[PDB]
Amino acid sequence: SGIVPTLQNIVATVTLGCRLDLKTVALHARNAEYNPKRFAAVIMRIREPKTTALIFASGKMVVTGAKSEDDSKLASRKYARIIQKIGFAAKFTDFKIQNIVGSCDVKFPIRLEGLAFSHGTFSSYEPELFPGLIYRMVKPKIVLLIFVSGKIVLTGAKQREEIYQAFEAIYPVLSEFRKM
DNA sequence: CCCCACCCCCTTTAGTACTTATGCCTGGTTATAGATACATTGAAACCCCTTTTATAGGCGCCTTTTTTTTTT
């Protein structure tokens, strides 16, 4: 294909192994918002790497927004370090990436309804609901959002390799339905 | 002094008409069992809260601009 999808977002979970007083975290950490009435967790953001963590009373958290596996682990470590610095027996445990999202640009337009009619068992296209075509790939198990513009969204991957393999697999069919 | 006649009685049983109690059946409302109106406390079942990064239509709602109609 000659193109390599760009990783745009990585979601990871981390068990800090120790109960937390969310009310206290929200009070001593900067850039933290806590509104239990709507979500039972403290939302905290940091600038390097630019990410957002969801911290729970159970001591477990979700780190989002990271653009690489390293930034994800690194950011996760900083959040844990803050929880500690606040006064908890937090530890960096069970780090695990749960989802990777990537995007592409094949540069050419795509006749989506032709692609949907051709691959009916994998794609759901109804512009009324959503402008992009939803392609549910089997191997690897990656969901793609194909747009008329040639823009491609790939998600559902746990290894960055799946995004790459998903894109290579779809390129031929994308090319086949190129508007030209 | 004797004979005959008249008066007074008790004997018990058969008749059908009339009165009283029992069985009959009949018009209210009261006392029973269960469900209904429904209302009870009990519980489970439900949506709700922390965000990200990109794609791109439709969606509703804001203040400022231009056009049309009315009045003087």
Coordinates of C-alpha atoms (C1' of nucleotides) in Angstrom, one line a residue:
Chain A
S1 CA 0.0 0.0 0.0
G2 CA 2.9 2.3 0.9
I3 CA 1.1 3.9 3.8
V4 CA 1.4 3.3 7.5
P5 CA -1.5 4.1 9.8
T6 CA -0.9 6.6 12.6
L7 CA -1.6 5.6 16.2
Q8 CA -3.9 8.2 17.6
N9 CA -5.1 6.9 20.9
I10 CA -4.1 4.1 23.4
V11 CA -6.2 3.1 26.4
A12 CA -4.5 1.2 29.2
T13 CA -5.5 0.0 32.7
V14 CA -3.4 0.0 35.8
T15 CA -4.0 -1.5 39.2
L16 CA -2.4 0.7 41.9
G17 CA -3.1 -2.0 44.5
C18 CA -4.6 0.1 47.4
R19 CA -8.0 1.7 48.2
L20 CA -8.3 5.4 47.4
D21 CA -10.2 8.4 48.9
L22 CA -11.3 10.1 45.7
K23 CA -12.3 13.1 47.7
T24 CA -8.8 13.5 48.9
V25 CA -7.2 12.9 45.6
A26 CA -9.4 15.6 44.0
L27 CA -8.3 18.0 46.8
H28 CA -4.5 17.5 46.6
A29 CA -4.0 16.9 42.9
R30 CA -4.0 19.7 40.4
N31 CA -6.1 19.5 37.2
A32 CA -8.4 17.1 38.8
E33 CA -12.2 17.0 38.7
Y34 CA -14.4 14.9 40.9
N35 CA -18.2 14.9 40.5
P36 CA -19.4 11.5 42.1
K37 CA -23.0 12.5 41.3
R38 CA -22.2 11.7 37.6
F39 CA -19.1 9.4 37.7
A40 CA -17.6 7.7 40.7
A41 CA -14.0 8.5 39.7
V42 CA -11.5 11.3 39.7
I43 CA -10.6 12.6 36.2
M44 CA -7.0 13.8 36.1
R45 CA -4.9 15.1 33.2
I46 CA -1.2 15.7 32.7
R47 CA 0.8 17.4 29.9
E48 CA 3.7 15.0 29.4
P49 CA 2.7 12.7 27.9
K50 CA -0.6 14.5 27.1
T51 CA -3.1 12.1 28.6
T52 CA -6.1 11.8 30.9
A53 CA -6.5 9.3 33.7
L54 CA -9.7 7.9 35.3
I55 CA -8.9 7.1 38.9
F56 CA -11.2 4.9 41.0
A57 CA -11.8 4.4 44.7
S58 CA -10.7 0.8 44.2
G59 CA -7.2 2.0 43.3
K60 CA -7.6 1.0 39.7
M61 CA -7.3 3.5 36.8
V62 CA -7.6 3.9 33.1
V63 CA -5.1 6.0 31.1
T64 CA -6.3 7.5 27.8
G65 CA -5.0 9.7 25.0
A66 CA -1.5 8.2 24.8
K67 CA -0.1 7.9 21.2
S68 CA 2.5 5.2 21.8
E69 CA 2.9 2.2 24.0
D70 CA 5.8 3.9 25.8
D71 CA 3.9 7.1 26.4
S72 CA 1.1 5.1 27.9
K73 CA 3.2 3.2 30.4
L74 CA 5.1 6.4 31.1
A75 CA 2.0 8.5 31.7
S76 CA 0.6 5.6 33.8
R77 CA 3.7 5.8 36.0
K78 CA 3.3 9.5 36.5
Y79 CA -0.3 9.2 37.7
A80 CA 0.6 6.5 40.1
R81 CA 3.5 8.7 41.3
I82 CA 1.1 11.5 42.0
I83 CA -1.3 9.3 44.0
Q84 CA 1.7 8.2 46.1
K85 CA 3.0 11.8 46.4
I86 CA -0.4 12.6 47.8
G87 CA -0.2 10.0 50.5
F88 CA -1.4 6.5 49.3
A89 CA 0.4 3.2 49.2
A90 CA -0.1 3.2 45.4
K91 CA 2.0 0.9 43.2
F92 CA 2.4 0.5 39.5
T93 CA 0.8 -2.9 38.8
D94 CA -0.9 -4.9 36.1
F95 CA -0.2 -2.4 33.3
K96 CA -2.1 -3.5 30.2
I97 CA -3.1 -1.8 26.9
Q98 CA -6.8 -2.4 26.2
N99 CA -7.3 -0.5 22.9
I100 CA -5.4 1.1 20.1
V101 CA -6.9 3.5 17.5
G102 CA -5.2 4.6 14.3
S103 CA -6.1 6.7 11.3
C104 CA -5.1 6.8 7.6
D105 CA -5.5 8.7 4.5
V106 CA -5.4 6.7 1.3
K107 CA -5.6 10.1 -0.6
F108 CA -8.4 9.1 -2.9
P109 CA -12.3 9.2 -2.7
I110 CA -14.3 6.0 -2.0
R111 CA -17.7 4.9 -3.4
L112 CA -18.9 3.6 0.0
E113 CA -22.3 2.2 -1.1
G114 CA -20.6 0.0 -3.7
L115 CA -18.2 -1.3 -1.0
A116 CA -21.1 -1.9 1.4
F117 CA -23.1 -3.8 -1.2
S118 CA -20.1 -5.9 -2.1
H119 CA -19.1 -6.8 1.5
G120 CA -22.5 -6.8 3.0
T121 CA -21.6 -9.3 5.8
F122 CA -18.8 -7.0 7.2
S123 CA -20.0 -3.5 6.5
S124 CA -22.9 -1.4 7.7
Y125 CA -23.5 1.8 5.8
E126 CA -26.4 4.2 6.4
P127 CA -25.3 7.8 5.9
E128 CA -28.6 8.8 7.6
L129 CA -27.1 7.6 11.0
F130 CA -23.4 8.1 10.4
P131 CA -21.6 9.3 7.3
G132 CA -18.8 6.7 7.5
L133 CA -19.0 3.0 6.6
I134 CA -18.5 0.6 9.5
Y135 CA -16.4 -2.4 8.4
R136 CA -16.1 -5.2 11.0
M137 CA -13.0 -7.2 10.0
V138 CA -12.6 -10.7 11.1
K139 CA -8.9 -11.3 11.0
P140 CA -7.5 -9.4 12.6
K141 CA -10.6 -8.4 14.6
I142 CA -10.5 -4.6 13.9
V143 CA -13.3 -2.2 13.3
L144 CA -12.8 0.3 10.5
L145 CA -14.6 3.5 9.8
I146 CA -14.3 4.2 6.1
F147 CA -15.2 7.7 4.7
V148 CA -15.8 9.1 1.3
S149 CA -12.7 11.2 1.7
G150 CA -10.3 8.3 1.8
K151 CA -9.8 8.9 5.6
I152 CA -9.7 5.6 7.5
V153 CA -10.2 4.9 11.2
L154 CA -9.0 1.6 12.7
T155 CA -9.8 0.6 16.2
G156 CA -10.2 -2.5 18.5
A157 CA -6.6 -3.5 18.4
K158 CA -4.5 -4.6 21.4
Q159 CA -1.2 -4.7 19.5
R160 CA -0.2 -1.9 17.1
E161 CA 0.5 -4.7 14.6
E162 CA -3.2 -5.4 14.2
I163 CA -3.9 -1.9 13.0
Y164 CA -1.2 -2.3 10.4
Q165 CA -2.4 -5.8 9.3
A166 CA -6.0 -4.5 9.3
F167 CA -5.1 -1.6 7.0
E168 CA -3.1 -3.8 4.6
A169 CA -6.1 -6.2 4.3
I170 CA -8.5 -3.4 3.5
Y171 CA -6.4 -1.4 1.1
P172 CA -7.2 -3.6 -2.0
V173 CA -10.9 -3.3 -1.5
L174 CA -10.5 0.5 -0.7
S175 CA -8.6 0.8 -4.0
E176 CA -11.2 -1.3 -5.8
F177 CA -13.9 1.2 -4.9
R178 CA -11.9 4.3 -5.5
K179 CA -13.9 7.0 -7.3
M180 CA -12.0 7.6 -10.5
Chain B
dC1 C1' -155.1 -51.3 100.1
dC2 C1' -153.8 -52.2 95.3
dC3 C1' -153.1 -50.8 90.5
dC4 C1' -152.1 -47.4 86.9
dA5 C1' -150.0 -43.2 85.2
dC6 C1' -146.6 -39.5 85.3
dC7 C1' -142.2 -37.6 86.4
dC8 C1' -137.0 -37.6 86.8
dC9 C1' -132.5 -40.1 85.9
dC10 C1' -128.5 -41.8 84.3
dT11 C1' -126.2 -45.1 80.4
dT12 C1' -122.6 -44.3 76.8
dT13 C1' -121.8 -43.3 71.9
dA14 C1' -122.1 -41.2 66.9
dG15 C1' -122.4 -36.4 63.8
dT16 C1' -120.2 -32.9 61.6
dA17 C1' -118.6 -28.1 62.2
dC18 C1' -115.0 -25.1 64.3
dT19 C1' -110.4 -23.9 66.5
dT20 C1' -105.3 -24.6 67.2
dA21 C1' -100.7 -26.3 66.0
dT22 C1' -97.4 -28.1 62.3
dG23 C1' -95.5 -28.1 57.5
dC24 C1' -95.6 -25.6 53.6
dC25 C1' -93.6 -22.2 50.9
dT26 C1' -92.2 -17.1 50.3
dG27 C1' -90.2 -11.9 50.7
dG28 C1' -86.5 -9.0 53.1
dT29 C1' -81.7 -8.4 55.2
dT30 C1' -77.9 -10.4 58.0
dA31 C1' -73.7 -13.4 58.6
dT32 C1' -69.5 -16.2 55.6
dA33 C1' -65.8 -17.1 52.4
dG34 C1' -63.2 -15.4 48.9
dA35 C1' -61.7 -12.0 45.4
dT36 C1' -61.5 -6.9 44.1
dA37 C1' -60.2 -2.3 44.9
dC38 C1' -56.2 -1.6 45.6
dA39 C1' -52.5 0.1 49.0
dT40 C1' -48.6 -2.0 51.8
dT41 C1' -43.5 -2.6 52.6
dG42 C1' -40.2 -5.4 50.3
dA43 C1' -37.2 -6.0 47.0
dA44 C1' -34.6 -6.0 42.5
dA45 C1' -33.6 -3.5 38.1
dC46 C1' -32.3 0.7 36.0
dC47 C1' -29.3 4.4 34.3
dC48 C1' -25.6 7.5 36.1
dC49 C1' -20.7 9.4 37.2
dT50 C1' -14.2 9.6 35.3
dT51 C1' -12.0 10.7 28.8
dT52 C1' -9.5 10.2 24.7
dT53 C1' -8.6 11.2 19.1
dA54 C1' -10.0 11.1 14.3
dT55 C1' -13.2 10.7 10.7
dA56 C1' -18.0 14.1 8.9
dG57 C1' -22.7 14.1 8.0
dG58 C1' -27.2 16.1 10.9
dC59 C1' -29.1 18.4 15.0
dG60 C1' -30.8 22.5 17.6
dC61 C1' -30.1 27.3 19.1
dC62 C1' -27.4 32.1 19.3
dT63 C1' -27.0 37.0 17.7
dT64 C1' -26.4 40.0 13.8
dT65 C1' -27.8 41.0 8.9
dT66 C1' -31.0 41.9 5.1
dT67 C1' -35.7 42.3 3.2
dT68 C1' -40.6 43.3 3.3
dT69 C1' -44.6 45.6 5.1
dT70 C1' -46.9 49.2 7.7
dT71 C1' -47.7 53.9 9.3
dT72 C1' -47.0 58.9 9.0

